[PDB]
Symmetry: C2
Subunit: 174 residues, 2 copies
């Protein structure tokens, strides 16, 4: 009844999955079907989407450095994840992880969302900072649910169009 | 609205709390009032109680070695937490952590239990393996709720008395 198997060496697991912790995959979930969602996120990767997680998110930047673009108290801000840092993000704080370094690795821990508790993915205008587009999602399989979501934003000049100042958001890369 | 503060260096935090990660305290919670309960557990420590956590528990043995005495599929068993190992324990698997080494440190992550979801603490007979005593608890503050619980077991020859074979459990140390 050890449903998720025996203990195992983490650094070797990370080493062994180096090829997955780089584009295009980027990340790898450690156990499947668990309530705790346990993921290692490599790099490099940059993104323009901001995440609205209705639950907490735990980070431990095991290797290399990264940072989180955030919206804290109405202002754009940056939290660094230097190698060795840990950090706990409160529910709903908008965050956009940037991971510039190859070979970096970050332990990220989350919980499954109950039915009816949704995640938000959002984009903001570089020009005036207004919200450009939000999609909410019952997030069961990030790996497969999120790329079509992001993909549809990039493809729609409409979705990318700031309702405040008309600036068309750049889409994929800032 | 970074309610749990900024990122910070984890190894230095652990170093700085060395005096707390040894008897009598043994462990230190990283953030307070979070949904994710994030704890570093040092040593040495041995115990005879088995935990029935109604939710999952995540371990990452950062420094030194430890092990978990378990009841898996009706049998007494041992899962080692060698330095570097990670491990995810499924809900309700009975476990009794033993941490023989000084200077060891283990990241343990849990979730707050909703109202009405209780933890069990249990003891088993060395002689016949039958359940000797179980207390259930709405666990809000392990640090302060658990010592009086354990304490009351040790003090009662009655509670320590195996209902199957009459052997009085040794209590504090095996
Ligand atoms: Fe996220
Ligand atoms: Fe705008
Ligand atoms: Fe436990
Ligand atoms: Fe017995």
């Amino acid at each position: 009844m050890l449903t998720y198997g025996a203990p195992f060496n983490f650094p070797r697991w990370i080493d062994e999955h180096a090829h997955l912790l780089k584009p295009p995959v980027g990340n790898r979930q450690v156990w499947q079907d668990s309530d705790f969602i346990v993921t290692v996120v490599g790099g490099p990767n940059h993104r323009t989407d901001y995440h609205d997680d209705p639950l907490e998110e735990f980070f431990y930047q095991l290797r290399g450095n990264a940072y989180l673009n955030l919206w804290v108290d109405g202002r754009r801000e940056r939290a660094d994840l230097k190698e060795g840092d840990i950090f706990l993000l409160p529910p709903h704080v908008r965050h956009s992880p940037q991971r510039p370094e190859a070979g970096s690795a970050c332990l990220v821990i989350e919980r499954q969302r109950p039915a009816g508790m949704l995640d938000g993915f959002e984009w903001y205008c570089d020009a005036c900072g207004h919200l450009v587009h939000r999609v909410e999602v019952q997030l069961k399989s990030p790996v497969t649910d999120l790329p079509p979501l992001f993909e549809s934003f990039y493809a729609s000049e409409d979705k990318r169009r700031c309702p405040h100042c008309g600036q068309v958001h750049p889409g994929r890369a800032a």
